[PDB]
Amino acid sequence: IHVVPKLPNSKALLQNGVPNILSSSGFKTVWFDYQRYLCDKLTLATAGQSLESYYPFHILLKTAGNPLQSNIFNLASSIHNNHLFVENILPSAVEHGTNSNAVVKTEPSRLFLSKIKDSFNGSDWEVVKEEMIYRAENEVLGQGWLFLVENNEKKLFILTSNNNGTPYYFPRNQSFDLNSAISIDEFATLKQMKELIGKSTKLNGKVQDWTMPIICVNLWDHAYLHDYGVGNRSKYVKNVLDNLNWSVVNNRIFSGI
Amino acid sequence: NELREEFSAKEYLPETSLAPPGQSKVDLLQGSQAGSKIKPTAEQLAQWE
Amino acid sequence: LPRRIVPKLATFYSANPNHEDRINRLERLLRKYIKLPSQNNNEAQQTKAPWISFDEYALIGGGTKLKPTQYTQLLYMLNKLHNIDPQLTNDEITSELSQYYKKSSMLSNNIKIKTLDEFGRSIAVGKRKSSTAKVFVVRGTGEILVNGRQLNDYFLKMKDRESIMYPLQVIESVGKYNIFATTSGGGPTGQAESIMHAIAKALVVFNPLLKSRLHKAGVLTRDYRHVERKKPGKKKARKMPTWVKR
Amino acid sequence: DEVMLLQQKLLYDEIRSELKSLSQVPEDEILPELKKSLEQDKLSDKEQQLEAELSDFFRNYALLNKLFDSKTATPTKPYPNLIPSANDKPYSSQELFLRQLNHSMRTAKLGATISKVYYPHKDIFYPPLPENITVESLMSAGVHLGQSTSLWRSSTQSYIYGEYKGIHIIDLNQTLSYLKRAAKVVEGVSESGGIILFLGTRQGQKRGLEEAAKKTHGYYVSTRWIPGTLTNSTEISGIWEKQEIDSNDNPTERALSPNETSKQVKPDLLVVLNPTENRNALLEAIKSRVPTIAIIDTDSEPSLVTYPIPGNDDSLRSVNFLLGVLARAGQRGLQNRLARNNEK
Amino acid sequence: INNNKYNNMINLLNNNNNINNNNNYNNNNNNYIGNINNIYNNMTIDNIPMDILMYKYLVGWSIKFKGRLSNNNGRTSTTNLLNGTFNNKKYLWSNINNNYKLNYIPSNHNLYNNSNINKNGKYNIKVKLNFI
Amino acid sequence: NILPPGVSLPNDGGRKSKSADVAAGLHKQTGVDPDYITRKLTMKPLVMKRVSNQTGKGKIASFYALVVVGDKNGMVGLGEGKSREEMSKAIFKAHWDAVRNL
Amino acid sequence: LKLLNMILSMMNKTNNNNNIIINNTLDSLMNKKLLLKNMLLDMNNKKMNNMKRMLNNNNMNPAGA
RNA sequence: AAACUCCAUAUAUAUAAUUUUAAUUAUAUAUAAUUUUAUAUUAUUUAUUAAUAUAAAGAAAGGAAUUAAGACAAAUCAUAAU
Ligand SMILES: [Mg+2]
Ligand SMILES: [Mg+2]
Ligand SMILES: [Mg+2]
Ligand SMILES: [Mg+2]
Ligand SMILES: [Mg+2]
Ligand SMILES: [Mg+2]
Ligand SMILES: [Mg+2]
Ligand SMILES: [Mg+2]
Ligand SMILES: [Mg+2]
C-alpha cells in the first residue's frame, strides 16, 4: 500500500493553494488528487509483488531496464517528481503556522550562485531562468518535467524531459520527442547513447549515472490548466521560480562536508 | 628562530614534534636502505634484460 | 544494594564463549557500517596486515577450543573490515582491529651485504660431500686455476670442468671472469661441485639481480647429500646380511 | 593558507631526490674540492655566531633529545580522513558516495510512504507486547503450520485444530493462551533478577537469539548445546570467569575468590526453539531442576517442557515472532525492576 | 624478567643523564651502555632466582613391584602405580629445549631401581619420578 | 615454602570425614549446601561386592558399592559407584551419587 | 668553522638534475623550513640504528620466554 | 604418536698474536623450516578447501636414538646376583 505523504501546514494549503503559484482548487488538483490517484494506480500495479516493499525512487531505478515493466516505472517517476515539485514550492517546510513567523524568507545560497557561475557561461541567475522557460516552451509540447540537475562533473545542466523521465537515469530521460522530426546532432547523441548502454556488460543492461536533480517544476497540465488556463504555461513557470522555496534547494546541493 | 618556535609548540618525541609535511609521526625503520637498497647501475640492468 | 554473581559473556553457555563474543563485536561493527564500499583494484592497499597466527589467537580467543573454521571466519571478517577505503573509515573500526593487528613486526639486523674487496674480487666458499672450495672471481678473461694448477691438469674428467663452467654459462659470461679456485677435501667431483657452487655465490656480488637465474639453475643450492653412517647391526648402511627363513 | 598545500601537495621532494642522487656519488670526487675551501670561504658576516648557534641547535635537537620518550573524544567530523577534491576537478568515488547518502536520507523518501507491508527485520527489533497479540498476527507469522500427518505424534492431539493440505493445523487460541503464560513467566523471572538462557541451533536463528539476550540481559547459545553443560558444569564451564553485579546490572569491579569462580551458575529459565534436536538440553534441565519453555510442533513431546508454546518451529519468522514477544516481556520486567530499585 | 631488563636498557640509553651522545658512546666496538645499577633495576636476589629455578615440583611418579613377592602358585607378579604425568610442559611451548641425560634420559626424569632378597628369591622396586 | 598459586597446604586428611569432601564437591557442582549433607544425612552401605570384567590383558576387577543416604525425616537416596583402585572410592562415588539423587 | 661548505654545495645543487636556473618556486625561505627537518630526521634514523645495534650487542636474557 | 634430543646443514657473534695453521679450520651461544606466497585446473561441505600445475622467496634435502600394554612359561642360572 502506497499512501500520499502528509504535508506540513496542511490546513493552510487546503484553505488556499500555494501563494503566487497555484490556487486552492489547482493545488487540490495536483496534490490531494491525481496524487492519491497516482498512488492508487501504482499500488494496484505492484500489489502482491516484491516492488510493493520499495519506495518510488528505488522502484523506478529497478524498473528502468525492463521494457514491459514501464507502467510501474512511469507511475513511480511521476510520484517522485511530483513530490519533488511540491516540496520545492512549499511556502514553508517549518511548522511555524501557529507561531506566525511570516518573516521567514528564502534566498539562494552563495554556493548555489557560485555553481551557476561555473555552469553555462557564467550568466546571471535571471538569465538562466529566462532561457530555462524558453526551452520549456520550445521542446516540451505536451506534458513533461523541468529539471536543473547536477552531474558527476560538477556542472549544472537543464534537462527537458518530455515525459515521466527521471534525470537519475539518462537512458530514461525522455528528453527528445521522436514523434516530431529530429535534427542530425540530436540523432547522433541518441546513437551515442545507444552505444554507451550497449557497452555495459551487466546482465540487466544498466549503466551508471548520478545526475540527481535540484529544481523540479511540474509541466503536466494538471497544474496550470486551471490557474493559468492554456498557453500561459510560460507565466506559470515564471511565477513558480519567482517564489521558489530556496532552503530545500540549496540543501539539495552537496554541501561537501 | 621560527624553527625553534615551532618546536616550542610540542613537548614530545623528535618525530612527533617535527610534524613532517607527509605526516608519518612515527618513522620506525630496521636496517639501512631496506627498500631502496642500491640502484642497479646501467650495465647490470642491460645484462639482466 | 543486593549483589549477585553472573557470567561475563552472553555466550558463557556456548561451546567457545570468548571467540563468540569477539566475533559478535566484529559483526556489530560490520553490520553497523554495511556501507563504505570495499577497496578498488588491489596491489596498492592490501597484503599489508599480518593479522595473527592460529597460536597467537588461541591465547586470547578460543584457546584449546579454537577451531580451524573459527579462525577462518575471524580472519575473513577482519579482512572485510580492513577492505574499506581508508578515507572513509573511522576510529571505531581501526581501534577494534588494532588488537588483531598485533605487534607482528620483528626487528631485523646483521645483513652485511657482500661487496667487492680492495682488489675487486668476489670471495665465496662452497661445499659438497667432504669438500670445500674458496674461489676468487675477478673480471677479466676466461682464465682459471685450481690449487695453483691448470684446470686440465687438476681435473682429468671433462664433466668436472663442465660443472665448474656452468654458473659462468647460465649467465652468458664465460669469457669475462677470472677464477682462482682453492678447493680442498674430498675427491674430484666433490671439489669440482664445491667450486661451481662457490662461483655461483661469488657471481651475485657482481650483479645482484642475477640471483634468480642462478637459483632456478640450481647452482645456488647446497647439495646436502653425504655419506650416511654405517648402521650398527647390519652391513654397510642400508644393507643387511642374508636373512634365512629356516 | 591553502597556498602552502597547493604547491604539489608535499613539495621539497626535489631535495630528497638530490640527496638520494648524491648518496651513490663517491666522496673521493667532491671532498677534495671542499676540504680546502674551509680555510678561504669564511668570507664576511658573523661566522662565529652562526656556527655556535648551529652547534647548540645540533646538541639540543639531534644529540640531546628524548628520541624514545618514556613508557610508550568528540566525533566532530565524520569521515575525518576524506581528501576533498579540487574545485575544478570532478567528484571522486568517495565524495560521490557521500553525495549518494545525502540524497538517500531524505530525497529517496519523496513519493508515497509505505504502509501495511511486512518487513522481516521488524519482527526482531520492534516485537509486540503479549497483551496486544492477535490470532491474526500469529497466523500471518505462520505459527499454525504443523508437521505432516505422516509425522504426527499423538501426544499433541489436544493442540491441533485439524489437518489441511497434508499438514496438521495447530489451534491458535491455545497457542495464544500458552504464549501469554510463557511470556509473563519470563517477565516474572527477569523482574526477579534471574538468568534467562535462549537456546536455538537451527540455521539462521542466531540474530534473534542475540537480540533477545541483549534486550533481556540474558544469555544465548546459538552453537550446539554441549552435553553436561548443567550436570557437568565444573568440568565444562569451570574455566570461564564471572562477575558480581548490583541491583542495576552494573558490574562491581571486585575480584572473585577461586571458590566463587569455581562454583556453578544455573540458568533460572531455559527457552528452546528446537526441542526436537536439543533433547539432551531438556533432559539436563529436568534433571537439574530448571523450568523450560519450548515451541512444540506436531512432532514434539509437550511433557518434556514446563511451559509449552504450541506452534511452528521450522520457520524463522514464527520462531522470531514468538521469541520477540518473549524477549519484550523479559525486557519490560527488567525495566520494572530497574525502576523499582532506582525508586521504590 | 626479560621485558623488565629490556625496559631498563631503553630507559638507561635514552636518557643516560642526557650527557652521553653519539661520537661519545663509541658506537664502533664499545658496548658500555651505562651504570650497572640501572641494567638490573628491581632485579635482585629476592625475586629472580627462585622463580627461575627448575625441577621444583613432583607431578608424576610411578612405582613397580616386580618379582616373586606374592606367594602365588609360584609365578611372578608386577604391580604398577602410575600417578600424574610424565612429560614437561614448559619445554614444548617456551623456547627452552630439553636435554637428554647420558643421551637417553629426559632431564625431567629421575629413575632408579633397587633389588633385595625375600624368602622366595629376588625382587626389584623400580621408581621413576618427573620433576617439573 | 614453594606452594604454587592455586593450591592449598595439606592438613589432617585421615581424620577429615569423606562426608565433608562429598559435601564440598556437591556444593561446588550443584547448589546443595554442605552443612546439611555433613550433619543431617546418614551413610549406610547396602551392597559391597567385587565385579570382574575380562579383557585381552586379563581379568579386571572392579569394586561395586551401593549406599543409601537419608535424613530420617522424609528424604532418601540411592547411589551406586564403581572403582578399580579400592572400595573406599566406590563408597565415595556411591555417597556422591546418592546425595545427588535424593 | 663548523664546515658548512656542504651546506653551500647542497644549496647550489638544490635545483640541479631538474633545471639549472629556477627561481624560489614559492618556497618558505630559499628552501630552509623543511630542509633542516629532513636532515634532522635522517640523523634520527642514524640514532635509531644506533639504538637497535647497541640493544642487540648487549642483549642477554635467560631462556624460557 | 608427534615435538623437544644428537650427527649433518645455512647464517650471525666470540676465541685463535694464522709457527699446534687449516682461518677452505676448530667449538661455544643464538637464529632458521614440521617452509612460505601467489596464480590457475580439478572434485568438494564452494574457497568459511583438498590435489595438479605454474610462478617467486629461500641454503633448506637427510640420517641416528627412542620400539608402549600384552603374548610367545620365547633367550639367558656360562656377564653377575638370589
Ligand atoms: Mg662407502
Ligand atoms: Mg518442527
Ligand atoms: Mg691458514
Ligand atoms: Mg618420538
Ligand atoms: Mg611392547
Ligand atoms: Mg594385539
Ligand atoms: Mg622354555
Ligand atoms: Mg647351564
Ligand atoms: Mg654364577
From Swiss-Prot, chain A:
<dbReference type="GO" id="GO:0005743">
    <property type="term" value="C:mitochondrial inner membrane"/>
</dbReference>
<dbReference type="GO" id="GO:0004784">
    <property type="term" value="F:superoxide dismutase activity"/>
</dbReference>
<dbReference type="InterPro" id="IPR036324">
    <property type="entry name" value="Mn/Fe_SOD_N_sf"/>
</dbReference>
<dbReference type="GO" id="GO:0046872">
    <property type="term" value="F:metal ion binding"/>
</dbReference>
<protein>
    <recommendedName>
        <fullName>Small ribosomal subunit protein mS42</fullName>
    </recommendedName>
</protein>
<dbReference type="GO" id="GO:0005763">
    <property type="term" value="C:mitochondrial small ribosomal subunit"/>
</dbReference>
<dbReference type="GO" id="GO:0005739">
    <property type="term" value="C:mitochondrion"/>
</dbReference>
<comment type="function">
    <text>Component of the mitochondrial ribosome (mitoribosome), a dedicated translation machinery responsible for the synthesis of mitochondrial genome-encoded proteins, including at least some of the essential transmembrane subunits of the mitochondrial respiratory chain. The mitoribosomes are attached to the mitochondrial inner membrane and translation products are cotranslationally integrated into the membrane.</text>
</comment>
<dbReference type="GO" id="GO:0003735">
    <property type="term" value="F:structural constituent of ribosome"/>
</dbReference>
<comment type="similarity">
    <text>Belongs to the mitochondrion-specific ribosomal protein mS42 family.</text>
</comment>
<dbReference type="GO" id="GO:0032543">
    <property type="term" value="P:mitochondrial translation"/>
</dbReference>
<keyword id="KW-0689">Ribosomal protein</keyword>
<dbReference type="GO" id="GO:0005737">
    <property type="term" value="C:cytoplasm"/>
</dbReference>
<comment type="subunit">
    <text>Component of the mitochondrial small ribosomal subunit (mt-SSU). Mature yeast 74S mitochondrial ribosomes consist of a small (37S) and a large (54S) subunit. The 37S small subunit contains a 15S ribosomal RNA (15S mt-rRNA) and 34 different proteins. The 54S large subunit contains a 21S rRNA (21S mt-rRNA) and 46 different proteins. mS42 forms a heterodimer with mS43, building a large protuberance adjacent to the mRNA channel exit in the mt-SSU body.</text>
</comment>
<keyword id="KW-0687">Ribonucleoprotein</keyword>
<dbReference type="Pfam" id="PF02777">
    <property type="entry name" value="Sod_Fe_C"/>
</dbReference>
<dbReference type="InterPro" id="IPR019832">
    <property type="entry name" value="Mn/Fe_SOD_C"/>
</dbReference>
<dbReference type="InterPro" id="IPR036314">
    <property type="entry name" value="SOD_C_sf"/>
</dbReference>
<keyword id="KW-0496">Mitochondrion</keyword>
